Design an enzyme around this catalytic site. Sequence first.
Site, PDB file in Angstrom:
ATOM      1  N   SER A 186       5.109  -2.512  -4.098  1.00 43.93           N
ATOM      2  CA  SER A 186       3.864  -1.819  -3.789  1.00 43.93           C
ATOM      3  C   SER A 186       3.560  -0.744  -4.826  1.00 43.93           C
ATOM      4  O   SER A 186       2.399  -0.552  -5.204  1.00 43.93           O
ATOM      5  CB  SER A 186       3.941  -1.218  -2.387  1.00 43.93           C
ATOM      6  OG  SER A 186       2.647  -0.939  -1.879  1.00 43.93           O
ATOM      7  N   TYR A 198       1.545  -1.401  -7.875  1.00 47.79           N
ATOM      8  CA  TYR A 198       0.103  -1.501  -7.692  1.00 47.79           C
ATOM      9  C   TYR A 198      -0.596  -0.152  -7.785  1.00 47.79           C
ATOM     10  O   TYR A 198      -1.815  -0.088  -7.590  1.00 47.79           O
ATOM     11  CB  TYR A 198      -0.224  -2.159  -6.345  1.00 47.79           C
ATOM     12  CG  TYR A 198       0.052  -3.646  -6.328  1.00 47.79           C
ATOM     13  CD1 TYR A 198      -0.867  -4.548  -6.847  1.00 47.79           C
ATOM     14  CD2 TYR A 198       1.237  -4.147  -5.807  1.00 47.79           C
ATOM     15  CE1 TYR A 198      -0.614  -5.906  -6.843  1.00 47.79           C
ATOM     16  CE2 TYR A 198       1.498  -5.505  -5.800  1.00 47.79           C
ATOM     17  CZ  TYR A 198       0.568  -6.379  -6.319  1.00 47.79           C
ATOM     18  OH  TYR A 198       0.823  -7.732  -6.313  1.00 47.79           O
ATOM     19  N   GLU A 223       5.914 -10.509   0.741  1.00 48.23           N
ATOM     20  CA  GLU A 223       4.539 -10.019   0.843  1.00 48.23           C
ATOM     21  C   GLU A 223       4.048 -10.296   2.258  1.00 48.23           C
ATOM     22  O   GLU A 223       3.868 -11.457   2.632  1.00 48.23           O
ATOM     23  CB  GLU A 223       3.626 -10.690  -0.186  1.00 48.23           C
ATOM     24  CG  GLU A 223       4.103 -10.579  -1.624  1.00 48.23           C
ATOM     25  CD  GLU A 223       3.104 -11.156  -2.610  1.00 48.23           C
ATOM     26  OE1 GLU A 223       2.003 -11.553  -2.174  1.00 48.23           O
ATOM     27  OE2 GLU A 223       3.417 -11.213  -3.818  1.00 48.23           O
TER      28      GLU A 223
HETATM   29  N1  LIG Z   1     -12.054   1.801   1.922  1.00 51.93           N
HETATM   30  C1  LIG Z   1     -11.592   1.461   0.719  1.00 51.93           C
HETATM   31  N2  LIG Z   1     -12.005   2.177  -0.350  1.00 51.93           N
HETATM   32  C2  LIG Z   1     -11.522   1.869  -1.556  1.00 51.93           C
HETATM   33  N3  LIG Z   1     -10.645   0.919  -1.888  1.00 51.93           N
HETATM   34  C3  LIG Z   1     -10.256   0.224  -0.814  1.00 51.93           C
HETATM   35  C4  LIG Z   1     -10.673   0.417   0.493  1.00 51.93           C
HETATM   36  N4  LIG Z   1     -10.073  -0.502   1.340  1.00 51.93           N
HETATM   37  C5  LIG Z   1      -9.315  -1.214   0.541  1.00 51.93           C
HETATM   38  N5  LIG Z   1      -9.371  -0.826  -0.771  1.00 51.93           N
HETATM   39  C6  LIG Z   1      -8.588  -1.349  -1.885  1.00 51.93           C
HETATM   40  O1  LIG Z   1      -9.293  -2.415  -2.491  1.00 51.93           O
HETATM   41  C7  LIG Z   1      -8.346  -3.339  -3.057  1.00 51.93           C
HETATM   42  C8  LIG Z   1      -8.561  -4.749  -2.504  1.00 51.93           C
HETATM   43  O2  LIG Z   1      -9.456  -4.944  -1.702  1.00 51.93           O
HETATM   44  N6  LIG Z   1      -7.739  -5.742  -2.901  1.00 51.93           N
HETATM   45  C9  LIG Z   1      -6.819  -5.744  -4.050  1.00 51.93           C
HETATM   46  C10 LIG Z   1      -6.595  -7.165  -4.572  1.00 51.93           C
HETATM   47  N7  LIG Z   1      -5.950  -8.013  -3.552  1.00 51.93           N
HETATM   48  C11 LIG Z   1      -4.522  -8.231  -3.813  1.00 51.93           C
HETATM   49  C12 LIG Z   1      -3.494  -7.418  -3.046  1.00 51.93           C
HETATM   50  O3  LIG Z   1      -3.511  -7.371  -1.822  1.00 51.93           O
HETATM   51  N8  LIG Z   1      -2.502  -6.904  -3.812  1.00 51.93           N
HETATM   52  C13 LIG Z   1      -1.149  -6.781  -3.411  1.00 51.93           C
HETATM   53  C14 LIG Z   1      -0.301  -7.886  -3.468  1.00 51.93           C
HETATM   54  C15 LIG Z   1       1.000  -7.786  -2.993  1.00 51.93           C
HETATM   55  C16 LIG Z   1       1.473  -6.594  -2.463  1.00 51.93           C
HETATM   56  C17 LIG Z   1       0.624  -5.490  -2.427  1.00 51.93           C
HETATM   57  C18 LIG Z   1      -0.670  -5.569  -2.901  1.00 51.93           C
HETATM   58  C19 LIG Z   1      -1.331  -4.227  -2.803  1.00 51.93           C
HETATM   59  N9  LIG Z   1      -0.293  -3.439  -2.158  1.00 51.93           N
HETATM   60  C20 LIG Z   1       0.850  -4.113  -1.927  1.00 51.93           C
HETATM   61  O4  LIG Z   1       1.860  -3.650  -1.403  1.00 51.93           O
HETATM   62  C21 LIG Z   1      -6.229  -7.517  -2.202  1.00 51.93           C
HETATM   63  C22 LIG Z   1      -7.641  -6.984  -2.133  1.00 51.93           C
HETATM   64  C23 LIG Z   1      -6.949  -2.785  -2.732  1.00 51.93           C
HETATM   65  O5  LIG Z   1      -6.440  -2.012  -3.814  1.00 51.93           O
HETATM   66  C24 LIG Z   1      -7.234  -1.927  -1.499  1.00 51.93           C
HETATM   67  O6  LIG Z   1      -6.274  -0.893  -1.319  1.00 51.93           O
END
Ligand SMILES: Nc1ncnc2c1ncn2[C@@H]1O[C@H](C(=O)N2CCN(CC(=O)Nc3cccc4c3CNC4=O)CC2)[C@@H](O)[C@H]1O
Lengths: 469, 223
Positions: free
Chosen positions: A353, A356, A437
């Site tokens: 995590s 990221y 994950e």
């Molecule tokens: N209210 C909000 N305002 C701004 N950003 C916001 C939000 N709600 C979600 N997000 C953020 O947008 C991003 C998003 O949608 N994403 C990122 C891309 N995708 C891949 C993903 O889940 N990555 C991923 C993959 C594996 C593990 C982990 C992660 C992230 N954390 C972990 O532990 C998932 C969708 C993410 O970074 C989230 O934290």
Amino acid sequence: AAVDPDSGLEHSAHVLEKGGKVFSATLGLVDIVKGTNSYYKLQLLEDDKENRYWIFRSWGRVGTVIGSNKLEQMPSKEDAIEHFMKLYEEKTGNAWHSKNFTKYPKKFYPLEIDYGGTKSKLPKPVQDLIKMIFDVESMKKAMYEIDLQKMPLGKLSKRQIQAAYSILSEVQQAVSQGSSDSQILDLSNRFYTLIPHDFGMKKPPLLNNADSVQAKAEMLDNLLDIEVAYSLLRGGDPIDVNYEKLKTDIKVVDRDSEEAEIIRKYVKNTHATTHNAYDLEVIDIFKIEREGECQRYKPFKQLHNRRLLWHGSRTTNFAGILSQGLRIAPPEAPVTGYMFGKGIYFADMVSKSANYCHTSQGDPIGLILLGEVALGNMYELKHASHISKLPKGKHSVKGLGKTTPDPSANISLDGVDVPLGTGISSGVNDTSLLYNEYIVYDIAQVNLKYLLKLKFNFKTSLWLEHHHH
Amino acid sequence: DKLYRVEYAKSGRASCKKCSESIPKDSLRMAIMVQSPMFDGKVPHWYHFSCFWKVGHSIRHPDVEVDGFSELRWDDQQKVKKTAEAKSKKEKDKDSKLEKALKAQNDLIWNIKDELKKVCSTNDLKELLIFNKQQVPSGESAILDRVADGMVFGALLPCEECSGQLVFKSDAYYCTGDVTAWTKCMVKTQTPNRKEWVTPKEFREISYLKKLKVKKQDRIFPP
DNA sequence: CGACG
DNA sequence: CGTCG
Ligand SMILES: Nc1ncnc2c1ncn2[C@@H]1O[C@H](C(=O)N2CCN(CC(=O)Nc3cccc4c3CNC4=O)CC2)[C@@H](O)[C@H]1O
Ligand SMILES: [Zn+2]
Ligand SMILES: [Zn+2]
């Protein structure tokens, strides 16, 4: 807007803004087959002092010296406006003030360039946290900083970036079902028109390499969430104002608290230096409670197999997160690389995590959340699979990895399993993931509980001197 | 596409990049396509047929290396081919026969072109193209060339995908239409569908000035 | 691309 | 316009 420096009037004159229109067009024209990647800038300039008006043209090939310019001083602003509008018409096929624009063949396309008490009672760690998640300096810098390789023609508005995002999703849909090459070529031309690239003098490539298009989609998603965070910073002691904006309650967990020691053990045991050129140091612990999140989480509170898991993002987003809870991506966004469709992701090891957060050696501080996620019945998978429907009886998904926390060390905090064991081999064979994950698909299955500030002590000259003596 | 180009001067206005003199109109001239520093496009540097081979330009095979070669007159093709340098015998007889047929077709097209230029005007040719459902191109040279193509082989039918107009290049027929406002069509074929050419009755007095002789010829392409 | 017949 | 750089 900005006066094109190629004219030599930036300090002598400004750009004209009559009515609800600004006279600075930046048009692109792309043809992949023939290899053309041309730019055309048009500006109507007005002298800051007297009444003198100029028309400035600047054409060429993007990101190269190929091209030229021209500057004509006009007898009056009426003649200047006539000249500007007729030139725009000739080059794009549309009128200057036209709500519905329509691309015409062999004509340029217009790009949308983005131009331009002290009685805080809160504790010091929380004040620093708020200063961190609402840093207008860093955001404005990362946003309007002049990069000519990623933005050869200037910063693009959120509209055009979203347009290129949707076009990339269309490209993925076309590649999935063996669509015509004509479809893919049309989409590629549209994209490279909307997102100028500095290809020097090489022909632009087709959007056929799904890996490169996933990379481009990740870039565009980064830009989009940056734009969203900046839109958030501007809303209207200031520290307390932003605290109210978060719509969440924050408390500083005591260092010598026992739950704090549990959290620290969790961070310590689950950080693997195998793919992380750095060590994690806990700075502050925070207990967080979101506005009515407990309400929407009640339906899953008595569900089984609830787990306290990690989620890492870039600090710029955290503001947003705390004000809206973790959100799933929309159904029209392209895939950026995730392996199990669109949902809320979590990890059991802080390494996964934390990577990221994208923290750099310049800013070795990153934020990371702990969430009680109601996993319930797991769907355990070893290979990618964009799940739109969970099998009947399942509440979540788990991608299995080669390394996992020791299950014999599970702890029960608030009736919630915490996998703070050390890294061990899982025993799963033919698995592509390295670390587990966990994934949910209902925003309500997650209840954020703690937020951590971490220093990423990188193993550079300083760490080497401190570690060897 | 190609690095070299050859054609009859479409105007007596281009200056030779070597002798810096005006190239006279309709005179055989050869160009090298280079990048322009002024805009994102390729431009021909033109040369008299005389001054070209004096810049040390080694062209091994003109017909393939040079664009617009197959459109030249036969004797000028022979001239360009020569100056470029300074069971097998049954197939050789066959090759001679094919070369005779190619010369026939070439000088036939050119005779038709200059006969039309003798009798008809530019607008007459535009009308001939319209009546056969053909696009009117830019440049009276191209107008005449396409009128000749249509009269010899037949009025080209629209493309089947983009519904554009196909045109003959040195190689084969290429579509000049637009599949969308962002990309052009790229349909390439040597067997385009066409209906028989129909001279409007107005030009009948001049169509007997063509003595019919329509023939059942078919476009012969180089291997 | 703009310039000129 | 159509040619030329
Ligand atoms: N209210 C909000 N305002 C701004 N950003 C916001 C939000 N709600 C979600 N997000 C953020 O947008 C991003 C998003 O949608 N994403 C990122 C891309 N995708 C891949 C993903 O889940 N990555 C991923 C993959 C594996 C593990 C982990 C992660 C992230 N954390 C972990 O532990 C998932 C969708 C993410 O970074 C989230 O934290
Ligand atoms: Zn000469
Ligand atoms: Zn076509």
